[PDB]
Amino acid sequence: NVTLTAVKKAFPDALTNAELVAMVSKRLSQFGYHKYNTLLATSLCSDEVTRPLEQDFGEVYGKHFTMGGLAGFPFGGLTGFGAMAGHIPDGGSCLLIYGSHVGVSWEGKWGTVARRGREKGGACCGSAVAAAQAVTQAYQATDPLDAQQGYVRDMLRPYAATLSEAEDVMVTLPVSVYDAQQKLVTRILDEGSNHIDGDGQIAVVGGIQINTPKEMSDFFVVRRFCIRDSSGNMVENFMPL
Amino acid sequence: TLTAVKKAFPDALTNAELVAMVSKRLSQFGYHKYNTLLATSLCSDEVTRPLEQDFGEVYGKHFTMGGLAGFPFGGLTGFGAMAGHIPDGGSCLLIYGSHVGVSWEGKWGTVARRGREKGGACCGSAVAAAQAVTQAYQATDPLDAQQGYVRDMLRPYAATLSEAEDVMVTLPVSVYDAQQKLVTRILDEGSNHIDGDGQIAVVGGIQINTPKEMSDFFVVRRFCIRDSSGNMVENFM
Numbered sequence: 135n136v137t138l139t140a141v142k143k144a145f146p147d148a149l150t151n152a153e154l155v156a157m158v159s160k161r162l163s164q165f166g167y168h169k170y171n172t173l174l175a176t177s178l179c180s181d182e183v184t185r186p187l188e189q190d191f192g193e194v195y196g197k198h199f200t201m202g203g204l205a206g207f208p209f210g211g212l213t214g215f216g217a218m219a220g221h222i223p224d225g226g227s228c229l230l231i232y233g234s235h236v237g238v239s240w241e242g243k244w245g246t247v248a249r250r251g252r253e254k255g256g257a258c259c260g261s262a263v264a265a266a267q268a269v270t271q272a273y274q275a276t277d278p279l280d281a282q283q284g285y286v287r288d289m290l291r292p293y294a295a296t297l298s299e300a301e302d303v304m305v306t307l308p309v310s311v312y313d314a315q316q317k318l319v320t321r322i323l324d325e326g327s328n329h330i331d332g333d334g335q336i337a338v339v340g341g342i343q344i345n346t347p348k349e350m351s352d353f354f355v356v357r358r359f360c361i362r363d364s365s366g367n368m369v370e371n372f373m374p375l
Numbered sequence: 376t377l378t379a380v381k382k383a384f385p386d387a388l389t390n391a392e393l394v395a396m397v398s399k400r401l402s403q404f405g406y407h408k409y410n411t412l413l414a415t416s417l418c419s420d421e422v423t424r425p426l427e428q429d430f431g432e433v434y435g436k437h438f439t440m441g442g443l444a445g446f447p448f449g450g451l452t453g454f455g456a457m458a459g460h461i462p463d464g465g466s467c468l469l470i471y472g473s474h475v476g477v478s479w480e481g482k483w484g485t486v487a488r489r490g491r492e493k494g495g496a497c498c499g500s501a502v503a504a505a506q507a508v509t510q511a512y513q514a515t516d517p518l519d520a521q522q523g524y525v526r527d528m529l530r531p532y533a534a535t536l537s538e539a540e541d542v543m544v545t546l547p548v549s550v551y552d553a554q555q556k557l558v559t560r561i562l563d564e565g566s567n568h569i570d571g572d573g574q575i576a577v578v579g580g581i582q583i584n585t586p587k588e589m590s591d592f593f594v595v596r597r598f599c600i601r602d603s604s605g606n607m608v609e610n611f612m
């Protein structure tokens with residue numbers, strides 16, 4: 135269909151949720167990640183359409199720790215990571231799944247997707263799109279109440295030039311949000327490596343979550359898939375797929 | 376464990392009791408599965424997930440507003456986003472709360488965790504924030520911003536926490552009070568995003584996390600309905 139063709143034109147390497155979970159769990163099983171000894175953590179957007187990915191991994195690794203917030207940034211931060219690390223089964227490891235997301239419609243249009251019970255779905259990712267509008271308009275001019283969305287604007291500001299010049303800003307936006315996210319994730323992992331001990335590891339899957347209409351499988355574009363030791367050193371890199 | 380729970384919180388409900396009671400009441404006000412968006416503000420901690428799953432079985436996939444210690448860190452933008460996802464002519468149901476672990480031995484502030492000899496603190500975030508604000512009291516950047524906000528919101532409770540006979544049973548009550556103030560502010564400020572006959576139903580309280588082979592509990596402190604104007608239409612407490 136139009137939607138699937140659109141998805142694979144923008145991201146030829148995109149996997150279905152089912153393909154992703156099968157691939158990740160199979161690979162990690164060879165490195166001793168099983169259900170009993172793995173704590174799943176996610177950093178995905180607040181938006182309810184991102185839940186299926188959490189459910190799909192949760193079927194394999196159980197109830198997850200949530201690090202995310204608006205646009206999928208790991209707002210739980212250093213304290214959240216340390217808390218999570220203190221929950222890892224003894225002698226076990228963590229698996230962190232993070233990413234931006236974007237909707238694609240029945241017409242193959244990016245930045246929006248039909249939502250249950252609504253005639254108009256609005257923006258997807260709403261947070262990222264609003265932040266994009268704010269930073270690009272500021273550019274083209276060449277308190278916890280709302281603090282998170284403030285941070286999203288802050289982290290997207292370096293991409294303002296990139297966004298304004300983009301052929302399709304709605305495909306470029308989630309790529310930019312992912313790049314901003316992966317930098318923050320790296321920093322948290324570097325700062326929090328003290329919380330992982332001995333042969334404990336952290337496996338990381340990062341990329342772009344693609345939300346399609348409910349009658350269709352969602353997709354995920356993997357950009358990072360690797361394993362880090364307790365010292366913070368990369369031990370395995372599974373990219374490219 | 377159960378004795379300890381009812382000792383401190385005599386009105387505690389099991390998760391099952393809670394979901395049955397809430398869904399039964401809201402069905403009388405036209406809340407069903409197709410026309411309700413569920414939103415939660417619960418702690419990041421993986422032990423709070425069962426409550427979301429139990430409500431999720433009734434109302435579907437949920438919007439998350441929460442963060443460390445269960446504070447609605449999604450804030451105004453998060454609420455507005457969520458409101459724009461509500462089924463046409465429908466409503467939202469927001470479930471929020473602090474949480475606390477209680478152990479096999481009936482000790483507050485900790486609960487055995489899957490695969491671990493030692494469970495550590497529960498709520499971890501809240502306990503660490505309580506330590507920081509009490510010690511600072513008794514002395515009469517997104518990287519870690521969220522925990523900074525938890526400390527900020529707990530600071531008014533410093534005296535209460537320092538004078539508590541058991542700070543671990545008192546802490547989730549203070550955190551709930553801090554949360555309910557922020558939730559009310561968000562709902563007041565974001566009232567514009569609810570239109571027409573649309574409503575916001577709110578359930579707030581203290582989530583009690585017990586060992587895995589035991590039902591979790593919830594202490595309801597708030598259960599009410601708000602209209603699109605932000606006025607309270609029903610109070611079930």
Ligand SMILES: [Zn+2]
Pocket residue numbers: 179180181204205206235258259260261262
């Ligand atoms: Zn989003």
Ligand SMILES: [Zn+2]
Pocket residue numbers: 418419420443444445474497498499500501
């Ligand atoms: Zn907690």
